[PDB]
Scaffold this motif. Structure first.
Motif, mmCIF file in Angstrom:
data_model
loop_
_atom_site.group_PDB
_atom_site.id
_atom_site.type_symbol
_atom_site.label_atom_id
_atom_site.label_comp_id
_atom_site.label_asym_id
_atom_site.label_seq_id
_atom_site.Cartn_x
_atom_site.Cartn_y
_atom_site.Cartn_z
ATOM 1 N N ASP A 731 0.858 -1.218 0.000
ATOM 2 C CA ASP A 731 0.000 0.000 0.000
ATOM 3 C C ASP A 731 0.874 1.242 0.000
ATOM 4 O O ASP A 731 0.370 2.372 0.232
ATOM 5 C CB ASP A 731 -1.007 0.009 1.156
ATOM 6 N N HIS A 732 2.127 1.121 -0.381
ATOM 7 C CA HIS A 732 3.089 2.251 -0.329
ATOM 8 C C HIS A 732 2.592 3.406 -1.177
ATOM 9 O O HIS A 732 2.109 3.190 -2.319
ATOM 10 C CB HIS A 732 4.465 1.829 -0.815
ATOM 11 N N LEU A 733 2.826 4.624 -0.713
ATOM 12 C CA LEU A 733 2.555 5.828 -1.509
ATOM 13 C C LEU A 733 3.626 5.971 -2.587
ATOM 14 O O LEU A 733 4.788 6.072 -2.248
ATOM 15 C CB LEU A 733 2.538 7.030 -0.565
ATOM 16 N N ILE A 734 3.213 6.063 -3.854
ATOM 17 C CA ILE A 734 4.132 6.287 -4.994
ATOM 18 C C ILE A 734 3.957 7.738 -5.458
ATOM 19 O O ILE A 734 2.841 8.158 -5.712
ATOM 20 C CB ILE A 734 3.835 5.244 -6.077
ATOM 21 N N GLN A 735 5.047 8.496 -5.484
ATOM 22 C CA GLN A 735 5.128 9.871 -5.978
ATOM 23 C C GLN A 735 5.597 9.777 -7.418
ATOM 24 O O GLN A 735 6.631 9.112 -7.664
ATOM 25 C CB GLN A 735 6.127 10.638 -5.120
ATOM 26 N N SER A 754 -10.952 4.084 -1.371
ATOM 27 C CA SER A 754 -9.992 5.207 -1.367
ATOM 28 C C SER A 754 -10.711 6.500 -1.745
ATOM 29 O O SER A 754 -11.421 6.526 -2.757
ATOM 30 C CB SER A 754 -8.816 4.952 -2.292
ATOM 31 N N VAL A 755 -10.390 7.584 -1.043
ATOM 32 C CA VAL A 755 -10.784 8.959 -1.426
ATOM 33 C C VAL A 755 -9.514 9.738 -1.721
ATOM 34 O O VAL A 755 -9.590 10.992 -1.758
ATOM 35 C CB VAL A 755 -11.690 9.618 -0.373
ATOM 36 N N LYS A 764 -1.296 5.697 -3.608
ATOM 37 C CA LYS A 764 -0.945 4.455 -2.890
ATOM 38 C C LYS A 764 -1.129 3.261 -3.818
ATOM 39 O O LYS A 764 -2.122 3.190 -4.541
ATOM 40 C CB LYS A 764 -1.754 4.304 -1.605
ATOM 41 N N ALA A 765 -0.225 2.300 -3.753
ATOM 42 C CA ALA A 765 -0.474 0.952 -4.286
ATOM 43 C C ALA A 765 -1.693 0.385 -3.530
ATOM 44 O O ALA A 765 -1.934 0.725 -2.348
ATOM 45 C CB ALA A 765 0.741 0.063 -4.170
ATOM 46 N N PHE A 766 -2.474 -0.429 -4.207
ATOM 47 C CA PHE A 766 -3.506 -1.237 -3.554
ATOM 48 C C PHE A 766 -3.222 -2.655 -4.012
ATOM 49 O O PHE A 766 -3.152 -2.907 -5.208
ATOM 50 C CB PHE A 766 -4.917 -0.724 -3.867
#
Ligand SMILES: [Cl-]
Length: 803
Positions: A731-735, A754-755, A764-766
């Protein structure tokens, strides 16, 4: 050129704190307004709003009132031409103004409409001002609509005597007979408008070309009078020798060129792509295309394109329908409104059949601001627009007069159903009419006595669509032997990509604290079925033409069963998530619907040592042997069964359309070896325990795209361990950082709950993955996408754009 792209140089502003009623005035000051190109959906750019008048049904994205303005001059090359302003679609209830005067108002949000502006434009390079008020006061929709001029805008520029809008109708009468005689008989009806101030005599030349541009047929009409302000009608017959049929495997289309002749001179030229194909719905035998029997392997599709919202894009919609075709789909239902011209182009080019559906309501409203309040005055116009737009498209097999229409239990509904089928038949008699009807479902078990008004509507349409009504498939066929039955809407099973909850529990319309649904085909709405059960009921019956599952793709809004459960904002029904990422059920449909051998394991292989994991294999192979770290956990097989009329299918002795093990977890590699009856290996699949997250991996679906400002590359961002294995719950946030000749059109991960913004440069990865959508600009060059995540190594991908 006869059609001009009119998408550039617009200005836009939402009505928020103060009235924009003055924006109709040419002199209105719009220098503060945002400058943009269409197509445009203003809703998808907004933050989610838990208090939205759209509610969960509309995905918690505001609509309201918005205004578009465009200031332009007319080129001198257009003097003495007929000019029309053509909108492919505006959601919804628009009012259009030119130079301060109303051209008209257009309630319906999913049809094209056109205004003749020949006598209203300022020529001589004086400034003209167009103003479009869009009124999406909410709630207007049971799904995410979007707001604004979300489909393309054009000018049509012709000489005063011209082929009318939708002015050709190409048909292939008795094609089955003609084809056995090595030909296609081609009937051409042509409408010529005389918009000059005096009568003319006109002839129509019709020339048919093959896809290589070789002439194959030619016919010139008799001469006919066209009085000033009237339409002349022509009807001509010709022959294509040894025709190429339009089929799912070879979606071949000819091109009609229409030349409008006055005194031997061409005053107009108009093109019509068409295909030669024939099809039949049979009360006992089901459906056949060009004489080949086949089931309709159908999906329902809504009109949104995920992170693009409603804003139409040819590549985005082609990608959705390519993924459906990869699942083994042969048919689509346009639930519940006419599709975009980009969607039609995709089904025509990919080889998919389409049900086009006009209405989600007749006069009885489902939502306050929906079309119901317009229906009694506009329905004839809107149903005829749909039919007239699409009558030449080979993909379209049927016209649906509505979905789950409350009115069908009333005598008012009977009268409306007669009007709608009469109006359709005034444009096109070559395709069956249909409806999708849910109100015979009853108790889901016994054959439901049909309401007398529904029964008279089922006699009024050509082909009866049942929604969620498996209990009636046999009974209605026995009681009504002339009916052609199909499942217009089935299953409505709910599932999250990569979520493997309550593995041995089959739950109906159940909410969980995780705001997800399970991908063991074990979550579904109380009115619905598992994917498996809805398929079995169809598979087993020759007379039942096939089914359209709810749904092919997730869409925004209708987060059932999470009715009041912000941040649950988008659907769980899709076989594929909004991002284009397949869920496990995609492979279940492949296993039932496709011939090419495959095998697909679930779940992932990141569990706790010793825990018994429910392992499934979706496969069209006779048997599968499962391996863990190289050692057999045993063979599972199907029986080679036959339907009552001898069609082969694979099912276990216990009635399952998949294979199953219970495996005590041990980290490493789980492998499924699929084998034929003889033990020969015909496919394999593996899942490996992922290590610690280590990197972001980027993959482009297309490394080269067109520098046309609208083409897209779809970039998968995965979280992988140091060996490249996807981390299945990451679920990491990817910039994202984009540089070069392009823009980030959107980001997504398909998470219903997700919102996170779709219009942003991070996601985020899901379940291990996210999507970035890269769009080209009009200058060729390179686009570079850099993707980083805290504590991981970065991913990079370069896209080339060609001019
Ligand atoms: Cl056609």
């Amino acid at each position: 050129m006869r059609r001009i792209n009119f998408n550039d140089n617009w200005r836009f502003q939402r009505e928020i704190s103060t009235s924009l009623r003055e924006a109709q005035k040419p002199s209105f000051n719009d220098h503060s307004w945002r400058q943009l190109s269409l197509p445009h959906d203003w809703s998808i750019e907004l933050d989610f709003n838990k208090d939205s008048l759209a509610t969960h049904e509309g995905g918690y994205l505001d609509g309201g009132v918005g205004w578009y303005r465009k200031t332009f001059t007319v080129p001198s090359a257009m003097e003495g031409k007929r000019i029309s302003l053509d909108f492919d679609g505006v959601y919804m209830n628009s009012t259009t103004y030119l130079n301060g005067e109303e051209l008209g108002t257009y309630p319906f949000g999913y049809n094209a409409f056109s205004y003749d502006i020949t006598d209203k434009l300022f020529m001589d390079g004086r400034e003209n001002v167009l103003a479009v008020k869009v009124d999406n006061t909410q709630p207007s929709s049971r799904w995410y609509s979007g707001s604004g001029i979300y489909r393309n805008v054009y000018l049509t520029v012709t000489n005063p005597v011209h082929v009318a809008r939708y002015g050709t109708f190409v048909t292939t009468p008795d094609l089955e007979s003609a084809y056995a005689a090595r030909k296609a008989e081609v009937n051409i009806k042509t409408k010529i408008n005389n918009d000059s101030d005096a009568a003319v005599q006109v002839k129509v030349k019709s020339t048919i070309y093959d896809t290589d541009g070789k002439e194959v047929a030619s016919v010139v009409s008799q001469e006919k009078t066209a009085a000033a302000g009237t339409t002349a009608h022509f009807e001509d017959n010709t022959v294509i020798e040894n025709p190429e049929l339009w089929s799912l495997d070879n979606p071949y289309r000819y091109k009609l060129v229409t030349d409008v002749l006055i005194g031997g001179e061409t005053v107009d030229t108009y093109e019509t792509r068409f295909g030669a194909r024939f099809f039949k719905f049979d009360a006992n035998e089901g459906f056949s295309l060009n004489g080949k029997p086949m089931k309709l392997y159908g999906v329902s599709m809504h009109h949104d394109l995920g992170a693009l919202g409603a804003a139409t894009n040819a590549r985005a919609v082609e990608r959705q329908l390519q993924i459906m075709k990869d699942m083994g789909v042969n048919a689509i239902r346009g639930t519940h409104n006419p599709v975009s011209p980009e969607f039609l182009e995709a089904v025509n080019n990919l080889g998919l059949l389409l049900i086009e559906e006009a209405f989600d309501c007749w006069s009885q409203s489902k939502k306050t601001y929906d079309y119901g309040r317009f229906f009694t005055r506009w329905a004839e116009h809107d149903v005829k627009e749909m039919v007239d737009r699409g009558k030449n498209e080979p993909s379209i097999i049927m016209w649906s007069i509505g979905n789950e229409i409350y009115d069908t239990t009333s005598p008012s509904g009977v009268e409306t159903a007669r009007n709608l089928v009469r109006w359709i038949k005034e444009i096109d008699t070559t395709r069956p009419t249909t409806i999708g009807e849910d109100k015979t479902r009853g108790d889901k078990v016994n054959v439901t006595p049909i309401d007398p008004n529904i029964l008279e509507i089922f006699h009024t349409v050509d082909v009866v669509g049942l929604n969620y009504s498996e209990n009636n498939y046999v009974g209605y066929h026995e009681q009504h032997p002339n009916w052609k039955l199909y499942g217009s809407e089935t299953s409505s099973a709910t599932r999250s990509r990569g979520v493997y909850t309550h593995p041995y529990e089959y739950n109906l319309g159940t909410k969980y604290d995780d705001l997800q649904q399970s991908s063991y085909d074990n979550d579904y709405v109380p009115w619905g079925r598992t994917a498996e059960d809805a398929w079995k009921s169809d598979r087993d019956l020759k007379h039942f033409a096939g089914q359209f599952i709810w749904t092919g793709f997730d869409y925004i809004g209708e987060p059932t069963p999470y009715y009041d459960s912000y941040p649950a904002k988008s659907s769980y029904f899709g076989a594929v998530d909004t991002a284009g990422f397949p869920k496990d059920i995609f492979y279940y449909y492949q296993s039932q619907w496709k011939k090419e051998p495959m095998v697909h394991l679930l779940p992932h292989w990141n569990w706790t040592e010793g825990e018994p994991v429910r392992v499934l294999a979706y496969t069209n192979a006779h048997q599968v042997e499962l391996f863990l770290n190289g050692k057999s956990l045993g063979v599972r097989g199907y029986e080679n069964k036959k339907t009552s009329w001898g069609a082969p299918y694979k099912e276990t002795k216990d009635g399952k359309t998949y294979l199953e093990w219970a495996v005590p977890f041990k980290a490493g590699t789980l492998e499924a070896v699929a084998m034929d009856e003889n033990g020969k290996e015909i496919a394999r699949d593996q899942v490996t325990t992922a290590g610690a997250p280590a990197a972001v991996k980027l993959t482009a679906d297309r490394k080269v795209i067109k520098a046309d400002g609208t083409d897209l590359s779809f970039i998968t961002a995965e979280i992988v361990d140091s060996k490249g294995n996807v981390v299945p719950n990451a679920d990491h946030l990817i910039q994202f950082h984009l540089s070069g000749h392009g823009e980030l059109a959107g980001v997504d991960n398909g998470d219903a709950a997700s919102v996170e913004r779709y219009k942003d440069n991070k996601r985020k990865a899901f379940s291990g993955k996210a999507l970035a959508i890269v769009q080209s600009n009009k200058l060729d060059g390179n686009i570079t996408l850099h993707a980083s995540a805290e504590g991981l190594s970065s991913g990079n991908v370069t896209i080339f754009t060609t001019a």
